[PDB]
């Protein structure tokens, strides 16, 4: 069926393409997105999905979010500015490529061309996201997952950072506004790090609700931004929600804490807002397997399928997820699989009874209540009540009844 879940991916985002990359004997190597694409295939999820062809963002598209100067530097191929040669032109190409132990060739990661190819892959990743987003926003597709790299959510107007050159999700949102006049867009960013770029892009805009869940720990975790305080400016006051977790890893945030955060902050506010489209900066660095500096949290991959199913209850299900961070191949492959499975309407493997029974930790509850206190000023859904943040899912269920 063609009104179904869309997928985007492009081999030209990859440094090196190898067949048998995923492997099942000994060797590692082969990156993040190639590994996810391979998992989507051997699970057969790609077969149920409509594979969409991506493209480069135009330089005009990139400038919906970023400066002309930023876009020209990182967006354009650098060899075009050096007036076409032949001997010097051939010399650069011998430095770009390098034969690898498996017989295949790829972009040499131990040369200057690494970050140049990354900036080019970023321009491709943006256009890939925009294509999927528009096919979903238009009803051509129901759903979407963008298997894309590098990430984009830290990339600011005139500043690349955190491996981000261009903010794919923010660009796609700007284009929905300009080209389709979409009245209300919800952007949920569940990468473990604050999406400073996306916040900045829409900070004074009430037409897009930006909601980040991230490790904040009072300003000491990368990128250091995203205080619960930061609620928007001008007409956008109230429409920036930083579900900032504080208290460190005493204990680490897990499934229960994020599920509680959705129950008490994300779904209430998002439902009230009532978006026409939902975009997700879907990093997977919060899942277990991302030690303390990179991540520190231990969500399960299957929690992400449940978080996806939740967001699918908004905007009539007009939702697109785009990969951001996450490193551990198993973790991001398990999470990607759980998310695409959810998007296809497959029955999700139940959460373990342990998770459903578990009350969120005290640091989590305190983090959630600080956010709700701050945002009660802006949302009718947090003015009616008192916090049930410290209840488990089953308790919340039991104590909704009578
Ligand atoms: O935390 C990050 C991240 C940047 C981008 C991250 C992301 O959100 O996962 C993204 F962008 F890939 F999606 S996470 N850092 C901090 C640590 N770091 C380092 C380290 C250097 C020395 C020791 C530990 C880390 C190099 N580059 C970085 C960027
Ligand atoms: K985030
Ligand atoms: K906003
Ligand atoms: Zn290889
Ligand atoms: Zn991250």
Verify whether residue 154 is a known catalytic residue. yes
Nearest CA to ligand 1 atom 28: 162
Please compute Rg for the chain using Cα positions.
Answer: 21
CB neighbour class for 227 (10 Å; exposed up to 12, middle 13-18, buried from 19): middle
Residue matched to tokens 């694409």: 37
Q: List phi, psi (to 5°) of 341.
A: -55, -45
Place of tokens 């869940």: 213
Count, in order, helices (H) and strands (E) of the chain. Answer: 15, 10
C-beta of 194 in contact with ligand 1 (< 6 A):
no
Atom 6 of ligand 1, residue of closest alpha carbon: 162
Domain ranges, residue 375 = 1-402
Which residues sit opposite 324 in a β-bridge? none
User: Is the CB of 189 inside a 6 Å radius of any atom of ligand 1?
Assistant: no
Residue 190 contacts residue 287 (beta carbons within 8 Å): no
* Residue whose structure tokens are 């001008």: 234
Q: Is 305 in the pocket of ligand 1 (CB under 6 A)?
A: no
Question: At 198, which helix (H) or strand (E)?
Answer: helix 196-201
Kindly state if the Cβ of 97 falls inside 6 Å of ligand 1.
no
Q: Among 33, 167, 193, 326, name the best residue to mutate to test ligand 1's pocket (greatest count of ligand atoms within 8 A of Cβ).
A: 193
Q: How far is the CA of 84 from the centre of ligand 3 (A)?
A: 45
State if residue 120 touches ligand 1 by the CB under 6 angstroms criterion: no
Instruction: Give how far Cα 8 sits from Cα of 21, 31, 77, 167, 396, Å.
Output: 19, 17, 23, 16, 37
CB 270 within 8 A of CB 209: yes
C-beta separation of 174 from 201 below 8 A? yes
Which method resolved this structure? X-ray
Quick check: CB of 163 below 6 Å from ligand 1?
Answer: yes
User: Atom 29, ligand 1: which residue's CA is nearest?
Assistant: 162
DSSP 52-121: EE--PPPHHHHTTTS-HHHHHHHHS-GGGGS---SHHHHHHHHHHEEE-TTS-EEE-TTSTHHHHHHHHH
Instruction: Give CA–CA dist 214/204, Å, rounded.
Output: 21
CA of 111 from ligand 4 middle (Å) equals 18
What letter does residue 18 receive in the DSSP assignment?
-
Count structural domains, the chain.
1
Does the beta carbon of 285 lie inside 6 Å of ligand 1?
Answer: yes
Nearest to 283 by CA among 207, 204, 374, 222: 222
Task: Give the nearest ligand 1 atom to 164 CA.
Answer: 11
The answer to whether 20 is a known ligand-binding residue is yes
What CATH number is given to the structural domain containing 50?
A: 3.40.800.20
Give the number of other Cβ atoms within 10 Å of residue 28's Cβ. Answer: 7
Ligand 1 atom nearest 152 alpha carbon = 11
Residue 313 CA to ligand 2 center (angstroms) comes to: 20
* Marked catalytic residue, from 154, 193, 214, 375: 154
Resolution in A: 2.1
Dihedral angle, C-alpha 348, 354, 359, 363, nearest 10 °: -90
327 is in an annotated binding site: no
CA of 53 to the centre of ligand 4 (A): 24
Q: What residues sit around ligand 5, an ion, with C-beta below 5 angstroms?
A: 191-193, 283, 285, 325
Name the token pair of 94: 């011998």
């Amino acid at each position: 069926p063609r009104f179904t879940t869309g997928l985007v991916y492009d081999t030209l985002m990859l440094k090196h393409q190898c067949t048998c990359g995923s492997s099942s004997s000994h060797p590692e190597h082969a990156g993040r997105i190639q590994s996810i694409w391979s998992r989507l295939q051997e699970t057969g999820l790609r077969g149920k999905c409509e594979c969409i062809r991506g493209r480069k963002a135009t330089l005009e598209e990139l400038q919906t979010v970023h400066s002309e100067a930023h876009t020209l530097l990182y967006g354009t191929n650098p060899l075009n500015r050096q007036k076409l040669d032949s001997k010097k032109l051939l010399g650069s190409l011998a430095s770009v490529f390098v034969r690898l132990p498996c017989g295949g060739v790829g972009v040499d990661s131990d040369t200057i061309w690494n970050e140049v190819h990354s900036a080019g892959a970023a321009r491709l990743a943006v256009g890939c996201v925009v294509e999927l987003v528009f096919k979903v926003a238009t009803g051509e597709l129901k759903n979407g997952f963008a298997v894309v790299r590098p990430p984009g959510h830290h990339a600011e107007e005139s500043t690349p950072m955190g491996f981000c050159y261009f903010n794919s999700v923010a660009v796609a949102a700007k284009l929905l506004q300009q080209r389709l006049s979409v009245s209300k867009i919800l952007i949920v960013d569940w990468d473990v790090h604050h999406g400073n770029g996306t916040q900045q892009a829409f900070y004074s805009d009430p037409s897009v609700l930006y909601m980040s869940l991230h490790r904040y720990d009072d300003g000491n975790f990368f990128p250091g931004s995203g205080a619960p305080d930061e609620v928007g400016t001008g007409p956008g006051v109230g429409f920036n929600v930083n579900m900032a977790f504080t208290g460190g890893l005493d204990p680490p945030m897990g499934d229960a804490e994020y599920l509680a955060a959705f129950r008490t902050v994300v779904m209430p506010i998002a439902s009230e807002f009532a978006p026409d489209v939902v975009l997700v900066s879907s990093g997977f660095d919060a899942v277990e397997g991302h030690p303390t500096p990179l991540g520190g949290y231990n969500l399960s991959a299957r929690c992400f399928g449940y978080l996806t199913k939740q967001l699918m209850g908004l905007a009539g299900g007009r939702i697109v997820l785009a990969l951001e961070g996450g490193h551990d191949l198993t973790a991001i492959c398990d999470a990607s699989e759980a998310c695409v499975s959810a998007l296809l309407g497959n029955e999700l493997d139940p959460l373990p009874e342990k998770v459903l029974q578990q009350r969120p930790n005290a640091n989590a509850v305190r983090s959630m209540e600080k956010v709700m206190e701050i945002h009660s000023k802006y949302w009718r859904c947090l003015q009616r009540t008192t916090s049930t943040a410290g209840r488990s899912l089953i308790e919340a269920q039991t104590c909704e009844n009578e």
